[PDB]
Write a protein that binds this ligand. Structure first.
Ligand SMILES: CO[C@H]1[C@H](O)[C@@H](O)[C@@H](O[C@H]2[C@H](O[C@@H]3CO[C@@H](O[C@@H]4CO[C@H](O)[C@H](O)[C@H]4O)[C@H](O)[C@H]3O)OC[C@@H](O)[C@@H]2O)O[C@@H]1C(=O)O
Ligand code: CL
Ligand code: CL
Ligand code: CL
Ligand code: MG
Length: 333
């Protein structure tokens, strides 16, 4: 059954692509099963503004035009991150040639110009953007203080603990100026089943959205939280459920943005763990169907195990020959 038909009334079904997925049998498989795609790499900061003022949209524009011509939607990923992001945005070389943070004013100017120029370039060719990715430390010991729980990344070091909020405000201004665009703004992160990290992300989004809503008649600044769903055979779906509930209580939409389930290593998937992997996918989709009114999209991070970013750990619904694994039957249910 095509995945997007099974879940047609529940959430968009997504995948995560490179230029390889837009031709041949892979394109057919992609179109048959998914309503939406995320660029695995082509819309990251390193790909779109590799040096200051040098915006490079040609490959990303070809990808998005082909995705749309082929009947699918595009989720935009990602405007602000501490990986795949050029050092010029938030650092410089001191005299003694050490890498040090830029000052707040200059980093804020780079942050805003990146977000605004990229969003204005694509316009409403995307349905959503991951504005800020992975800003939270793992297993934070004091999630009551979100700011102290933030990863001290290059953006934090140049701008300060308010940079996640400044990123969203810059994105929100573009949508205020282009009111006909329908684009949801998301904050995206992983290990969101760790109850400490989920509390810290909840506290961040709550503080930022409460202050915005008080000033703007109840409007959301952060529209969405992306649970990346980089899960493993020991992931406890009860902790997923607690986290999904917590985020829903913000009044945001949720997406499961980069779903995969590592099982095995060294490219070897034992038969009993193919069955364990299928069983956990089936438990997760049972959970997602139960919360479908608050879940906009569930995206798998890749098509098949040999082309996963974690290929060694056999994470996905199809094998290297594009043949359905037990996982696939677990999802279709
Ligand atoms: C051991 O070094 C390895 C890198 O650290 C590892 O990430 C990988 O780098 C590649 C790059 O691969 C993409 C990495 O991003 C993946 O997607 C991200 C997953 O992390 C978050 O959850 C993000 O939100 C999500 O965007 C992509 O799926 C991977 O394709 O691809 C460009 C390549 O030039 C880098 O080297 O591999 C490194 C390695 O040495 O193997
Ligand atoms: Cl092919
Ligand atoms: Cl073509
Ligand atoms: Cl408009
Ligand atoms: Mg890509």
């Amino acid at each position: 059954a095509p995945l997007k038909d099974v879940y047609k009334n529940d959430f968009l079904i997504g995948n995560a692509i490179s230029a390889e997925d837009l031709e041949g049998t892979r394109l057919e498989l992609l179109k048959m099963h998914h309503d939406v795609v995320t660029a695995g790499n082509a819309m990251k900061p390193d790909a779109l503004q590799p040096t200051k003022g040098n915006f490079t949209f040609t490959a990303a524009d070809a990808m998005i035009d082909k995705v749309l011509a082929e009947g699918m939607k595009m989720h935009g990923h990602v405007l602000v991150w501490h990986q795949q992001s050029p050092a010029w945005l938030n650092t410089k070389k001191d005299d003694n040639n050490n890498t040090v943070p830029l000052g707040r004013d200059e980093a804020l100017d780079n942050l805003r110009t990146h977000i605004q120029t990229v969003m204005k370039h694509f316009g409403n060719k995307v349905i959503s953007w991951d504005v800020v990715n992975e800003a939270m430390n793992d297993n934070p010991s004091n999630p009551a203080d979100y700011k102290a729980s933030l990863r001290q990344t290059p953006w934090y070091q140049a701008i300060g603990s308010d940079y996640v909020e400044q990123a969203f405000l810059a994105a929100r201004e573009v949508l205020d100026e282009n009111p006909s665009w329908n684009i949801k703004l998301y904050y995206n992160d992983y290990n969101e089943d760790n109850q400490n990290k989920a509390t810290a992300i909840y506290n961040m989004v709550k503080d930022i959205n409460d202050r915005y809503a008080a000033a703007h008649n109840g409007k959301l600044l952060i529209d969405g939280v992306g649970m990346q769903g980089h899960y493993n055979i020991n992931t406890n779906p009860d902790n997923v459920k607690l986290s999904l509930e917590k985020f829903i209580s913000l009044g945001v939409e949720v997406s499961v943005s980069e779903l995969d389930v590592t099982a095995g290593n060294n490219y070897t998937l034992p038969e009993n763990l193919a069955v364990g992997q299928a069983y956990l996918y089936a438990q997760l989709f049972k959970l997602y169907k139960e919360h479908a009114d608050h879940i906009a999209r569930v995206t798998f991070w890749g098509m098949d195990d040999n082309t996963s970013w974690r290929a060694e750990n056999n994470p996905l619904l199809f094998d290297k020959n594009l043949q359905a694994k037990p996982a696939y039957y677990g999802v279709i249910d």
